[PDB]
């Protein structure tokens, strides 16, 4: 499962961090701090194991998009999640500069929460995610009209 | 200090401006300083707002603000917060309910959860799958962190599960049930066991997850699990096939099973476009090979099929694994393939293939030395 997601610097500093499951954010920030030494080696280009976790990650311009997972997590699925997260970030921020990500931070976290709840993922398209975030509800619109009715 | 300025922003703001204030408040807090005198301002000028975007910032603040005073007792303001949450748990907007339910999965203070329980329980029977999928996780979460609040949670979820039609709610339901009640998840699994091969991917994944758990607690079900797992080697998604092959080796040292899982891994290395995935499953093949010397030698020509990936790292890994399986029985068949690859690097993409071509010449030279 995906314990947490982070966009972070190549030096191990979180630009944003979102814990989904069984992990405090402070613990996330500590894992990321030790992350760059595992990643900068040509060990693998996508995954490194450190502590009792695995980092699934890709470059995001000069940043890193990073999922933290337990070591038994389905890695094929987690690479697909990572791509989906990366696609969200690019579609949401005008640029992939740190400052611009920071501008869209809380929007980015709300989107991440549409994808992962408690570590598990939904097979959502970017369109469904955009739709969820819009929060347009027929019931809500219909209830206020039933309201003004009475 | 800066608190005052914030406080003034909440007092005089509108929805649009308060959204920017709440964003500053959040950033300030996460980065270090908790703004203590703010709670009551947020309750007064943010919570009664109707702006959905602002409401999400509110719950983000609820996640991080301190709940307890100096004497380890819940702050009084959160009585007012609970009326707010209980209203959001009853909102016409399905999304608000879903977002509020996600939040409750993070709440730990029983004194906050207790006045919300009836509303949460009601959400299990909402018409909208967006609400149901979040409520069943909420219920399992309350029970994990505060069992006395809902001692019948395992029964609730079981019931939720028996009538559920939404695949995402079915997946969440089974995950939630098994996280709090092995036995009742087991019974549920038994009723659906014959249809697992045509279950949806997500549910298939957690069903496999659970089967590994029960194979250890109840080893008498392990053969029926093994047969089912073999069948899942032919699943339609690559995630499930990967999950079935990882589990099958985890349950038995049997060479038939090992070779079978190996072959599925090799099929993935061939089928999947992502070269990092190719490298990952190749290392699964490699490790099986180390722990079972001999068992996979029949798959050597399938390994070599991976060489039709244009990536030099994929090509290098495939050749290493293959060379560690070259025996007298197959060396000539292997060298003929290598040469045929070598010939193709002269005709196709001569420049890009320079590194690969040298690697082929080297591997062919290896085969000569080994014999």
From TrEMBL, chain A:
It is found in: Cytoplasm; Cytoplasmic vesicle, COPI-coated vesicle membrane; Golgi apparatus membrane. The coatomer is a cytosolic protein complex that binds to dilysine motifs and reversibly associates with Golgi non-clathrin-coated vesicles, which further mediate biosynthetic protein transport from the ER, via the Golgi up to the trans Golgi network. Coatomer complex is required for budding from Golgi membranes, and is essential for the retrograde Golgi-to-ER transport of dilysine-tagged proteins. Oligomeric complex that consists of at least the alpha, beta, beta', gamma, delta, epsilon and zeta subunits. Belongs to the adaptor complexes medium subunit family. Delta-COP subfamily. This is Coatomer subunit delta. The chain holds residues 2 to 151 of 513 of the full protein.
UniProtKB/TrEMBL annotation, chain B:
Residues 3-371 form the Clathrin/coatomer adaptor adaptin-like N-terminal domain. It is found in: Cytoplasm; Golgi apparatus membrane; Cytoplasmic vesicle, COPI-coated vesicle membrane. Oligomeric complex that consists of at least the alpha, beta, beta', gamma, delta, epsilon and zeta subunits. The coatomer is a cytosolic protein complex that binds to dilysine motifs and reversibly associates with Golgi non-clathrin-coated vesicles, which further mediate biosynthetic protein transport from the ER, via the Golgi up to the trans Golgi network. Coatomer complex is required for budding from Golgi membranes, and is essential for the retrograde Golgi-to-ER transport of dilysine-tagged proteins. This is Coatomer subunit beta. The lineage of its organism: Eukaryota, Fungi, Dikarya, Ascomycota, Pezizomycotina. The chain holds residues 20 to 390 of 959 of the full protein.
């Amino acid at each position: 499962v995906v314990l947490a997601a982070s966009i972070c610097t190549r030096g191990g500093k979180a630009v944003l961090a979102r814990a989904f499951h069984d992990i405090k954010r402070s613990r996330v920030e500590a894992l990321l701090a030790s992350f760059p030494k595992a990643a900068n080696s040509g060990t693998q280009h996508t995954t490194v194991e450190q502590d009792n976790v695995r980092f699934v990650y890709q470059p995001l311009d000069e940043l890193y998009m990073v999922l933290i997972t337990n070591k038994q997590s389905n890695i094929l699925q987690d690479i697909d999640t990572l791509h989906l997260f990366a696609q969200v970030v690019t579609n949401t921020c005008r640029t992939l500069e740190e400052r611009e990500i920071l501008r869209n931070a809380y929007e980015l976290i709300s989107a991440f929460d549409e994808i992962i709840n408690l570590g598990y993922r939904e097979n959502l398209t970017i369109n469904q995610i955009k739709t969820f975030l819009e929060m347009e509800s027929h019931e809500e619109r219909i209830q206020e009209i039933i309201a003004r009715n009475k | 200090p800066t608190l005052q300025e914030l406080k003034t922003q909440l007092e005089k703001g509108n929805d649009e401006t308060k959204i920017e204030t709440m964003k500053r408040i959040l950033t300030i807090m996460l980065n270090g300083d908790p703004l203590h005198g703010l709670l009551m301002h947020i309750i007064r000028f943010v919570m009664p707002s109707k702006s959905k975007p602002l409401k999400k910032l509110l719950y983000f603040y609820y996640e991080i603000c301190p709940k307890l005073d100096s004497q380890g007792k819940l702050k009084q303001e959160f009585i007012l917060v609970c009326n707010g949450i209980r209203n959001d748990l009853q909102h016409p907007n399905e999304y608000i309910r879903g977002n509020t339910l996600r939040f409750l999965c993070k709440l730990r203070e029983p004194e906050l959860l207790e006045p919300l329980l009836s509303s949460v329980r009601a959400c299990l029977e909402h018409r909208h799958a967006y609400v149901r999928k979040n409520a069943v996780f909420a219920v399992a979460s309350i029970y994990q962190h505060a069992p006395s609040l809902i001692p019948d949670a395992a029964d609730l979820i079981a019931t939720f599960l028996e009538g559920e039609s939404d695949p995402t709610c079915k997946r969440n339901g089974f995950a939630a049930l098994s996280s709090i009640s092995h036995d009742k998840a087991l019974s549920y699994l038994g009723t659906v066991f014959e249809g697992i091969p045509n279950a949806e991917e997500l549910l298939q994944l957690v069903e496999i997850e659970f089967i590994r758990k029960d194979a250890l607690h109840n080893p008498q079900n392990k053969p029926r699990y093994l047969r089912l797992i073999f069948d899942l080697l032919e699943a339609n998604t690559s995630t499930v096939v990967y999950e079935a092959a990882s589990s099958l080796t985890a349950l038995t040292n049997n060479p038939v099973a090992v070779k079978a899982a190996a072959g599925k891994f090799i099929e993935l290395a061939i089928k999947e476009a992502d070269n990092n995935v190719k490298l990952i499953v190749l290392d699964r093949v490699d490790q099986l090979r180390q722990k079972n010397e001999g068992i996979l030698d029949d798959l050597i020509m399938e390994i070599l099929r991976v060489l039709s990936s244009p990536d030099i790292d994929v090509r290098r890994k495939a050749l290493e694994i293959a060379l560690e399986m070259v025996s007298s029985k197959n060396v000539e068949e292997v060298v003929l393939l290598l040469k045929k690859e070598l010939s193709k690097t002269v005709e196709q993409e001569y420049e890009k293939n320079s590194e690969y071509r040298q690697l082929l010449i080297h591997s062919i030279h290896q085969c000569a030395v080994k014999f």
